[PDB]
């Protein structure tokens, strides 16, 4: 609780990140873009730490991205808009808190 907001941070990334996921994946209806786009993302944030207090972050949506990421997986390997949307919907979840303030 801190209501304060970075420019340049990780939160930018998320933003950033997921407008371009969301901007290609309503484009042309290609999550494939949006995959690559948090794969390395997340990647980034994974191999990428930062600090004990963005520990807490990664932590925050950790479970999170897990449940969404297993829902990808689970779709790319299955095969469901539903389950995307599911993905969709924790990510935006995440997403949406990183915002919210």
Wanted: aromatic letters at 12%; a neutral charge.
């Amino acid at each position: 609780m801190e209501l304060i907001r970075v420019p340049i941070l990780w939160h930018e990334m998320w933003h950033e990140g997921l407008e371009e996921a969301s901007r290609l994946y309503f484009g042309e209806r290609n999550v494939k873009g949006m995959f690559e786009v948090l794969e390395p993302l997340h990647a980034m944030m994974e191999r990428g730490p930062q600090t004990l207090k963005e520990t807490s972050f990664n932590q925050a949506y950790g479970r999170d991205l897990m449940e969404a990421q297993e829902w990808c997986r689970k779709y790319m390997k299955s095969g469901n808009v539903k389950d995307l949307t599911q993905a969709w919907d924790l990510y935006y979840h995440v997403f949406r808190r990183i915002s919210k303030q």
